[PDB]
Ligand binder design. Structure first.
Ligand SMILES: Cc1nc2ccc(CCc3nc(-c4ccccc4)cn3C)c(C)n2c1C
Ligand SMILES: [Mg+2]
Ligand SMILES: [Zn+2]
Length: 313
């Protein structure tokens, strides 16, 4: 009960910054996550024994793929921790609880393949879930683990507080389907600009949590250049494996997934920063001004990709 988690001084200070890298020591990531729950939620949010057992079952259910792995889960949760800590008074007790768990769980049991590949392979999961295939699976795996004995971290919540948090988590995880982000950000753009955005309106809060989920999920583009550059290799290593599997089904993959077209990566990153990342962190900064360091870091990385194209590195 009087048991803090504490971190070495360099981590204690840097973990509060949006651009923090959780580092290569896997055995420290559980403690980093518990540290973040304790500071953003409280030492009383979860029974430590249950939380530790829940974290280790979540870890066990992430696969050894190059990008959509346990490191990505904890990275996306740290970005959410940074957003929550810079926007102290905007979020409910239940939202603080639900969103760090949602982030840790959002890619549970990912196989390194897109919704599109599952649909073309005719994977069983594509028949069970016609849209946001992997994301409905991730929520389903979250509920499974919550129902393991000794794993219900929400046990002290009332019946209706419990249903509310599981509903925050479901919407948060569904929102990580990037196909839904474009529409969601357009609506948030219009609401903010006509002045109709209202954070007492639940359907509005939902949209804003959706955008935060996109922002955390994409946070590799908000790191220092050497982190951003090295994560991009992991990201393309999955896409190219998927491209290879598309070719096995007799389908030319899109160039993004075709390892023969590696040369167009710098130009593909530009498109991505311009069409997805910058718009994402721009609208997030408009709604939540203290998240501006994410937009600034993203702009700095776009400018580094421009330098790569000009052969200045
Ligand atoms: C967090 C993060 N999430 C993602 C998701 C997708 C992409 C890939 C962008 C991208 N490359 C291409 C491309 C590359 C080589 C040849 C032809 C086309 C097209 N397109 C849209 C990146 C870089 N991401 C990052 C950095
Ligand atoms: Mg995902
Ligand atoms: Zn993800």
């Amino acid at each position: 009960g009087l048991m803090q988690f504490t971190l070495p001084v360099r981590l204690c200070k840097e973990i509060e910054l949006f651009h923090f890298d959780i580092g290569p020591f896997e055995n420290m990531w559980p403690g980093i996550f518990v540290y973040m729950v304790h500071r953003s939620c409280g030492t009383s949010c979860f029974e430590l024994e249950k939380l530790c057992r829940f974290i280790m079952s979540v870890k066990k259910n992430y696969r050894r793929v190059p990008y959509h792995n346990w490191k990505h889960a904890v990275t996306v949760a740290h970005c959410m921790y940074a957003i929550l800590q810079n926007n102290h008074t905007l979020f409910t007790d239940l939202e603080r609880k639900g969103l760090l768990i949602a982030c840790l769980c959002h890619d549970l049991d990912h196989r390194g393949f897109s919704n599109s590949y599952l649909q073309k392979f005719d994977h069983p999961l594509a028949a069970l879930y016609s849209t946001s295939t992997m994301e409905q699976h991730h929520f389903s795996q979250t509920v499974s683990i919550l129902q393991l004995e000794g794993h219900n971290i929400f046990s002290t919540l009332s019946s209706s507080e419990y249903e509310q948090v599981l509903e925050i988590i479901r919407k948060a995880i569904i929102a990580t389907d990037l196909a839904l982000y474009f529409g969601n950000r357009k609506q948030l753009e219009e609401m903010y600009q006509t002045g109709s955005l209202n954070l007492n309106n639940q359907s509005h809060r939902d949209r804003v949590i959706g955008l935060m989920m996109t922002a955390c999920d994409l946070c590799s583009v908000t790191k220092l250049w050497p982190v951003t550059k090295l994560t991009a290799n992991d990201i393309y290593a999955e896409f190219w494996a998927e491209g290879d599997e598309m070719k096995k089904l007799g389908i030319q993959p899109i160039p993004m997934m075709d390892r023969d077209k590696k040369d167009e990566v710098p130009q593909g990153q530009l498109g991505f920063y311009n069409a997805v990342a910058i718009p994402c962190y721009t609208t997030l900064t408009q709604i939540l001004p203290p998240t501006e360091p994410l937009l600034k870091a993203c702009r700095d990385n776009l400018s580094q990709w421009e330098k790569v194209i000009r052969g200045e590195e």
